Write a protein that binds this DNA or RNA. Structure first.
Ligand code: MG
Length: 118
RNA sequence: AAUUGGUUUCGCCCGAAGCAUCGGACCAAUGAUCACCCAGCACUUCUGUGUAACACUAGUCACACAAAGACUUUUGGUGGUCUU
C-alpha cells in the first residue's frame, strides 16, 4: 500500500534510530516528506515523526519540539496528499508528534478547502 | 611350619572440584586518549516558504529555514592505541 521511495527511506532511518543508535540526518527526513503521494504513507511518516521526537530527547537531550517551518511543510505535505484527518492533527496542542500549532497550517487547510468547496 | 584381616605412618605414580601465580590475548566489557560521522546552541547567505505593513500587485522587515556554509563548543555513535 505505501510507495517504495518512502518505504526504503522509512526502514533506513528506523534502522539508524534502533540499531546504530545515532540520529539520522534531517535531509532524509525531508526527502521522506517530499515523496508522499497516496493516502497510505502519512502514518509511516507519523511513525518516523514520533521516533525522532523520542530519540532527540532520549539520546541527544533535546527538549523543544520540531520547529515552526517544519510544521508548515508537513502540513502542506499532508494536505497536498489529501488526508484531511491527518493534516488537521498538525494544529493539535497535545500530540505525540511534537507538532506545535501554527497559523500557516490552517491557511493551507483553508486553501485546499477553497479548492475543494466544502 | 604355615594362614586371615585390620589400624597408623613413610617414600614413589596419576591428578576430580577449587583457591593461588604467570601467560598470550585489545578475546568480552569498563576507564583514558586520539581521530572520523551526524545533530544542537551561537552565526552569514545572491536559497524556498509563511506572517504582517505598504506599494497596486512589487518592495521592506519578523521568523523559523536545516537549504547550505565555514571556524569554535557540546550530545550520541564509529574506528584505532593504552608496557591491557
Ligand atoms: Mg586440576
Amino acid at each position: 500500500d505505501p510507495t517504495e521511495a518512502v518505504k526504503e527511506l522509512h526502514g533506513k532511518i528506523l534502522d539508524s534510530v534502533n540499531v546504530k543508535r545515532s540520529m539520522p540526518p534531517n535531509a532524509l527526513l525531508w526527502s521522506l516528506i517530499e515523496n508522499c503521494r497516496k493516502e497510505d504513507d502519512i502514518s509511516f511518516l507519523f511513525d518516523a515523526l514520533q521516533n525522532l521526537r523520542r530519540f532527540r530527547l532520549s539520546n541527544l537531550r533535546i527538549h523543544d519540539n520540531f520547529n515552526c517551518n517544519l510544521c508548515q511543510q508537513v502540513a502542506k505535505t499532508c494536505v497536498r496528499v489529501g488526508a484531511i484527518n491527518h493534516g488537521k492533527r498538525a494544529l493539535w496542542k497535545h500530540n505525540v508528534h511534537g507538532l506545535t500549532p501554527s497559523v500557516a497550517s490552517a491557511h493551507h487547510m483553508m486553501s485546499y478547502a477553497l479548492e475543494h468547496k466544502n
